Paper text:
We identified a 39-mer peptide region that was easily chemically synthesized and modified it to improve structural stability and mutation tolerance. The high-resolution structures identified the roles of the peptide residues and provided information on which residues to modify and how to modify them. Y501 of the RBD is an essential residue after the Omicron strain, but it was N501 in the WT and Delta strains. The binding surface composing of G22 and L26 contributed to binding to both tyrosine and asparagine, whereas the previous A22 and M26 reduced the binding ability to Y501. Y501 binds more tightly on G22 and L26 than N501, which contributes to the nondissociation properties of the Alpha strain. K417 interacts with D30, but N417 does not, which increases the dissociation rate of strains such as Beta and Omicron.
Residue numbers in the entry:
A (entry chain A): 1 to 39
B (entry chain B): 333 to 530
């Protein structure tokens, strides 16, 4: 399953935002989207 | 007699978030689409039926103007047949769309030093939106094996994310205001006519 790695990527996205890495957070968001489309 | 109030849409001070996109019904007025086309510097102005000039000879029952803010690199998803985070979970055009999609860079209004958090998008959804469907729900999203019970936690996510627009972003990650014009033709007397109709 992808549960642990999905959580870690989610957590980096949220941390990158809080630290003002607003554009890096959006790059991680895109990955979350593509990752979750896969079986 | 009345000129269509496109200004209320295109020149609004604040735009909607894409997940909760705004729709304005335009009716009972005269529309000059060539003047609209020339009214500002647009980064996108793509019509899928006929051109602005040709629109000016046409009458419609109503015109719908949908508006919202997305990233510059997401404007390509506001088009028939596209998939992606925005097309799938936020705003979906039908395969047979024949209206216009208009967009312009709004970094000067919709970005903030330290991040603008006013604009959000949906990152998680169990299924893709149907064309012109609008989902404003905020249920915690179950990404894993266990139910969330309305509580954020492990693999249990709030479904919306902030864009966090900052003016220093690269242009693909800068905010863009988008207006989608839909041209409705019912079996009905027209109420929105182009400037050179008849
Ligand atoms: C949005 O606002 C701008 C600014 O007022 C409008 O542009 C003006 O339009 C009038 C009439 O066409 C002109 O006389 C002015 O010279 C224009 N000003 C500028 C700075 O271009 C614009 O028309 C509005 N957009 C819409 C769709 O109504």
């Amino acid at each position: 399953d992808k549960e642990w790695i999905l959580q870690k990527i989610y957590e980096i996205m949220r941390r990158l935002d809080e630290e003002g890495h607003g554009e890096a957070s959006l790059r991680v968001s895109d990955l979350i989207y593509e990752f979750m489309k896969r079986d | 007699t009345n000129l269509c109030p496109f200004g209320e849409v295109f020149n609004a001070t604040r735009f909607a978030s894409v997940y909760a996109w705004n729709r304005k019904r335009i009716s009972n007025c005269v529309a000059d689409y060539s003047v609209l086309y020339n009214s500002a510097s647009f980064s996108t102005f793509k019509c899928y039926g006929v051109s602005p000039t040709k629109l000016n000879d046409l009458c419609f029952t109503n015109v719908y103007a949908d508006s919202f803010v997305i990233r510059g690199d997401e404007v390509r998803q506001i088009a028939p047949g596209q998939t992606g985070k925005i097309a799938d979970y936020n705003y979906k055009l039908p395969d047979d769309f024949t209206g216009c999609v208009i967009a312009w860079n709004s970094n000067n209004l919709d970005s903030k030093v330290g991040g603008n958090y006013n604009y959000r998008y949906r990152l998680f959804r169990k299924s893709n939106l149907k064309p012109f469907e609008r989902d404003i729900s905020t249920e915690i999203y179950q990404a894993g094996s266990k139910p969330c019970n309305g509580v954020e936690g492990f693999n249990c996510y709030f479904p919306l994310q902030s864009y966090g627009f900052q003016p220093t972003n690269g242009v693909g990650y800068q905010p863009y205001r988008v207006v989608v014009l839909s041209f409705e033709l019912l079996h009905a007397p027209a109420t929105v006519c182009g400037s050179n109709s008849e």
